[PDB]
Amino acid sequence: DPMLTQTAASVEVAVGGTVTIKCQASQSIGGYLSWYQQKPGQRPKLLIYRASTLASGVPSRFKGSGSGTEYTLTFSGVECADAAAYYCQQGYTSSDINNAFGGGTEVVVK
Amino acid sequence: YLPPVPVSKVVSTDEYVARTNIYYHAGTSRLLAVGHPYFPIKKPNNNKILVPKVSGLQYRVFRIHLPDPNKFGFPDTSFYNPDTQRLVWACVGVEVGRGQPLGVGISGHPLLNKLDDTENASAYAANAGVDNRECISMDYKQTQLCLIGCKPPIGEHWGKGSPCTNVAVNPGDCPPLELINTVIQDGDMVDTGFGAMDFTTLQANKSEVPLDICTSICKYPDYIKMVSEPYGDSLFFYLRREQMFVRHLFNRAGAVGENVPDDLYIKGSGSTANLASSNYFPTPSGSMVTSDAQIFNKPYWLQRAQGHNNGICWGNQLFVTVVDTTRSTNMSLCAAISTSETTYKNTNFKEYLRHGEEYDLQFIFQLCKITLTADVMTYIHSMNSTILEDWNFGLQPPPGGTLEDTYRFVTSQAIACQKHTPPAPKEDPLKKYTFWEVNLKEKFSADLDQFPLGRKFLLQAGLKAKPKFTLGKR
């Protein structure tokens, strides 16, 4: 069972700060990993997959890195509509796992 | 005391071996081989081989042990001093034969990595089932060869080696794929289809080709290494033959690492913003295997080698390899667990598969004596050390003793442990590499009139007074 913990509550950040959210995995998953933003009133919404390739309609000010077992997600220039919930998620599609790919939050930006 | 200078270049054998009129015939009896065509079957608990793998794609290297002609019997007017000259065998005619019907030999294993076909379609579906691989079977490519050398032949394959320690980013990387060449065993396979890569130390999914070449190496002979060596050894009469054809066009799983560039296609929209596949394996098929071009049961002879040495067989040894996949029949066998039921069933008869092969070899050898006066003695020892070491030219050590006590009852509690417990060489170095032994120690025959090849060689050359006029017409 590949497990990503994400036991990290996010720190208060101002406009223009940089945040390092770190998602670590027990088993090696390759590069297959996704990230999502969850605004607390609507459906979830994806930013980047395979830790390097961003989706359409998303600005290039979000970053992606990390390989092997640990991965990250950084960005700078925090707007007003970045108050949401974040989630890292693997794609190893195994059978005997109980993933839920959980963890991740983000404070209201001052 | 100051030996003369040795010649810096090598030389053909016409200058220092002699040729007499004394010929001999040696033909083995019959050689049969039965087993399974796909995998050598074994017990579920441990390693033990009930049936051998036998399929018609192997190499079948032979190893001919010849009788030593330094103690051998001859008719009259053949004389030599054993302190001055010695004797050696030379082959002048060889045959390879098979009696079988004429087969095909298809294969295919039930877990072959296929996704779709790329010959026609209407709409491509990105599917990616977990192991969605399916049984597909195929044909192979027909090949023939014959190589005759004093030492075993040499093949090649494309494998994997250690890269430079510059960059290490992922276990999902690519090997360097350097080229190496080894000595050929009895059981290595050939395919001129997918080609010479060992599918074990290179492919970890082991689901690329059918299962007859999946746990082993698919080799291929060189034809450059065995002619560029300065002696003319290891092959001196080769006859190559093969055919090929392409049948169908398919796709692998599709986990591409070497991605496509961007500036090659144009991006569309909707379902047209993805990739179908980039990796295509085609299937081979040998076609129209007609038995008029078969290079077999035809007694060819030798007057000239492609190399420097002729069919002089140093060390009283000879190697023959033949490759055939035209007799590749398969025998659908089945047997029933119970016969009393007057209705046929699912599981009352269970089936098997077997494969067989029949060989026969016949040779014509010619006597060759070699005089030695202080000049070729320097040359022969420099050619190979074992050629001079198989004949004793040095006198005795100071203790000779009675060679080995030779106890009578070899398994008891009286004596200590005996019989070759420390094995000092004197053996063949190639003991670690298996062959097919063919013992021909007393197969030879001085007359060759009543022999099935012997009149075919005799008819070709002059037969005038050689046959003799046994009891006459009037």
UniProtKB/Swiss-Prot annotation, chain B:
It comes from the Viruses. GO terms for molecular function: structural molecule activity. Pfam families: Late_protein_L1 (PF00500). Keywords: Capsid protein, Disulfide bond, Host nucleus, Host-virus interaction, Late protein, T=7 icosahedral capsid protein, Ubl conjugation, Viral attachment to host cell, Viral penetration into host cytoplasm, Virion, Virus endocytosis by host, Virus entry into host cell. It is found in: Virion; Host nucleus. One of its GO terms (biological process) is endocytosis involved in viral entry into host cell. Signal peptide: none annotated. GO terms for cellular component: host cell nucleus; T=7 icosahedral viral capsid. The keyword Disulfide bond applies. InterPro entries: Capsid_L1_Papillomavir, Capsid_L1_sf_Papillomavir, dsDNA_vir_gr_I_capsid. Transmembrane segments: none annotated. ISGylated by host HERC5, this results in dominant-negative effect on virus infectivity. Forms an icosahedral capsid with a T=7 symmetry and a 50 nm diameter. The capsid is composed of 72 pentamers linked to each other by disulfide bonds and associated with L2 proteins. Binds to heparan sulfate proteoglycans on cell surface of basal layer keratinocytes to provide initial virion attachment. This binding mediates a conformational change in the virus capsid that facilitates efficient infection. The virion enters the host cell via endocytosis. During virus trafficking, L1 protein dissociates from the viral DNA and the genomic DNA is released to the host nucleus. Self-assembles into homopentamers. The capsid has an icosahedral symmetry and consists of 72 capsomers, with each capsomer being a pentamer of L1. Interacts with the minor capsid protein L2; this interaction is necessary for viral genome encapsidation. Interacts with protein E2; this interaction enhances E2-dependent replication and transcription activation. Interacts with host KPNA2; this interaction mediates the nuclear localization of L1 capsomers. Interacts with host ITGA6. Interacts with host SDC1; this interaction promotes efficient infection of keratinocytes. HPV16, in comparison to HPV types 6 and 11, is more often associated with malignant genital cancers in humans. Belongs to the papillomaviridae L1 protein family. This is Major capsid protein L1. It comes from Human papillomavirus type 16. The gene is L1.
